[PDB]
């Protein structure tokens, strides 16, 4: 029985491979030779956020591009004013081993989680301004690796149990369960319309999920090692992923295959975070070599390097308006970068 | 400075005072990590240090030794794959590694786990406290003679007891020979690399002796002193 099932699976895999190869008529690198190069990009540190005591693990930007939340393993979730650097709130966490945080699109709630397997949501618009745990989501059998708010009542979460779930804050129970991964789900990225989202796991594979239907549509296996970071193209039709193989790969949903690979021989360290600019031309990816690089999404050439961190850049986030880029490292300091003419 | 900006600056100063208080409380405390297979008496030592004080994801047990607060975390509900969440403990004071010395057939698994934890990219500067737990069972098994380490470890036939051995007065030469052989097998893996930036502190434990807290306290003190000394480039 198992032999026939494995044979059928291999046959279907070969069929999918042939279908993908038949449509591979031209590569992005070939047609992009006639586009003007971006050239060297220089960015300086405009703000230096300090106050954290442990290695910063994750951060997220607000819809207004003004407030940002940074999560550190010291048991604190602080909100920083990107303009004046003044802190707005210092939420004390019950679990010190936090690994991810999320800022609601409306700016009313903030989520966080980590090795505790619980997604703690805090309200920022309480009646007396006293931030408190609004709802605690439990049920995952693995460390909470990432979470992103879909609305003021729904949130998608990833866990190390190779499973993702769609939570409801009002009731506090899973609405939809997304399965199919074999490794620990590191992070996910929601599409601009919040209808579809992609997630990576520790199996060199990335899958596309439907929030309303809950069924997997496409699976990308272009990487060679665990996929740590992932970001969606501004249009919602492509996405890039960072892995420990020191190589980024751009995948398209329509083509169902990789478009471009970003790697350099001198780079042999794993990738930590990736993000797409407002236009998508600049692919900013963090690395474990204590610095970050800016890759040309169309030319696959190193346009710049955002160095100045004392440790690996564990997180990276770009504002909704692209005015600046935030990069956090394990040195407990968060740097904000922005170019000038 | 406008009134809104002044209120924001006042709130920021209050948050900074709170963060300074938290910084004092944090630097005044230490953290620890408890590792080991299921066959080891991890829960035993946990309960021992808990009752004396001197789904879930991660458990936490707080105990005090000589007015010094210590925080030991034990993995209660997590997936078998540990390559990811182990990186979170790359800044702990020490890693308490408990091993079942009486489990010959699984001793190789513990050795491989210790080798993996030692040669990690991010744990290069984290010390590991090796607890050879369950010594009574090892002594009983050695005295019985039914199972011999020669089968699981052929090189044991040529091993001799170290000269600096300090065995328990009423200890049989075979028991001390076997326990020191296990200790040296673990040390050869611990001493195979590291360049002296992180050390290992082996100890003989039974999961019931009340001195485990004192041993951990001494290990943490030694580690902190060696770290302070390395800042001055004396080591």
């Amino acid at each position, epitope marked *: 029985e198992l032999d026939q099932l*494995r044979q059928e699976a291999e046959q279907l*895999k070969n069929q999918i491979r042939d279908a993908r190869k038949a449509c591979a008529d031209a590569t992005l690198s070939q047609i992009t030779n006639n586009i003007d190069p971006v050239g060297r990009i220089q960015m300086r540190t405009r703000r230096t956020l300090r106050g954290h005591l442990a290695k910063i693990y994750a951060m997220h930007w607000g819809t207004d591009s003004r407030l940002l939340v940074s999560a550190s393993q010291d048991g604190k979730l602080i909100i920083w004013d990107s303009y004046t650097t003044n802190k707005v709130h210092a939420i004390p966490l019950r679990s010190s081993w936090v690994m991810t945080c999320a800022y609601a699109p409306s700016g009313n709630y903030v989520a966080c989680g980590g090795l505790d397997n619980i997604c703690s949501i805090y309200n920022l618009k309480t009646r007396e301004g006293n931030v408190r745990v609004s709802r605690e989501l439990a049920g995952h059998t693995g460390y909470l690796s990432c979470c992103r708010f879909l609305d003021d009542n729904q949130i998608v979460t990833s866990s190390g149990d190779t499973t993702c779930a769609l939570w409801d804050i009002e009731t506090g129970q899973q609405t939809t369960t997304f399965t199919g991964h*074999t*490794g620990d789900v590191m992070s996910l990225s929601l599409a601009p319309d919040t209808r579809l989202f992609v997630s990576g796991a*520790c*199996d*060199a*594979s990335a899958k596309l999920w439907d929030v309303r239907e809950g069924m997997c549509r496409q699976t990308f*296996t272009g990487h*060679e*090692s*665990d996929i740590n970071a992932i970001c969606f193209f501004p249009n919602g039709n492509a996405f890039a992923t960072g892995s*420990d*193989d*020191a190589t980024c790969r751009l995948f398209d949903l329509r083509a169902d295959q990789e478009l471009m690979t970003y790697s350099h021989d001198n780079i*042999i360290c*794993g990738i930590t975070s990736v993000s797409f600019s407002k236009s998508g031309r600049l692919l900013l990816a963090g690395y474990d070599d204590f610095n970050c690089n800016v890759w040309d999404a169309l030319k696959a050439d190193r346009a710049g390097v955002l160095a100045g961190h004392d440790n690996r850049v564990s997180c990276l986030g770009v504002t909704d308006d692209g005015m600046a880029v935030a990069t956090g490292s394990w040195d407990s300091f968060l740097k904000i970068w922005n170019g000038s003419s | 400075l406008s009134a809104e900006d002044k209120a924001a600056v006042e709130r920021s100063k209050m948050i900074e005072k709170q963060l300074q208080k938290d910084k004092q409380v944090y630097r005044a405390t230490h953290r620890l990590l408890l590792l080991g297979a299921d066959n080891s008496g991890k829960s035993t030592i946990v309960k021992q240090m808990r009752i004396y004080h001197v789904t879930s994801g991660i458990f936490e047990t707080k105990f005090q030794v000589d007015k010094v607060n210590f925080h030991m975390f034990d993995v209660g509900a997590q997936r*078998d*794959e*540990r*390559r990811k969440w*182990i990186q979170c403990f790359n800044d702990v004071t020490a890693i308490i590694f408990v091993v079942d010395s009486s489990d010959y057939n699984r001793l*190789q*698994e513990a050795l*491989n786990d210790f*080798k*993996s934890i030692w*040669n*990690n*990219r991010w744990l290069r500067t984290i010390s590991v406290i090796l607890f050879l737990n369950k010594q009574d069972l090892l002594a009983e098994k050695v005295l019985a003679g039914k199972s011999k380490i020669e089968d*699981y*470890f*052929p*090189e044991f036939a040529r091993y001799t007891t170290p000269e600096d051995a300090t065995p328990e007065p009423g200890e049989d030469p075979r028991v001390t020979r076997a326990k020191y052989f296990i200790r040296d097998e673990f040390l050869r893996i611990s001493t195979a690399s590291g360049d002296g930036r992180h050390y290992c502190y082996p100890h003989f434990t039974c999961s019931v002796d009340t001195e485990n807290a004192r041993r951990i306290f001494n290990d943490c003190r030694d580690i902190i002193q060696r770290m302070h000394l390395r800042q001055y480039e004396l080591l």
Partner: nanobody
């Protein structure tokens, strides 16, 4: 896609010889460490041997020390495990596992219940 296809197995008399093979594809075989794992009937996965990137440093478990020989061909991207003087206790499905990350010295969870970068293994039964 990363895939490992082990080879070699079947009935083998105790004390004889048997040569296993594994085909590597989907990655730079030279940039990853290779480790051998087996699962005996009624027992869990156990580490057998490992080979470095260039093959300079090689180690074996005490149960197979001096009995098995592990070697890799960076050109052919194939791993070999020359097994001689087999014993009835060696009956187990040998699985080939790869280090999760490249340019590293630690194989954290190669011997895990649900490792991703491992092959299906081959049946090895040592019975007279």
């Amino acid at each position: 896609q990363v895939q490992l296809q082990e080879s070699g197995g079947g009935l083998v008399q105790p004390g004889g010889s048997l040569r296993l093979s594994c085909a590597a594809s989907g990655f730079t075989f030279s940039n990853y460490k290779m480790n051998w794992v087996r699962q005996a009937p009624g027992k869990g996965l156990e580490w057998v041997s490992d080979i470095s990137q260039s093959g300079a440093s090689i180690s074996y478990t005490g149960s197979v020390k001096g009995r098995f020989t592990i070697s890799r061909d960076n050109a052919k991207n194939t791993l070999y495990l020359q097994m001689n003087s087999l014993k009835p206790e060696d009956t187990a499905v040998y699985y080939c596992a790869r280090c999760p990350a490249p340019f590293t010295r630690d194989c954290f969870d190669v011997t895990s219940t649900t490792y991703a970068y491992r092959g299906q293994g081959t049946q090895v039964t040592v019975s007279s």
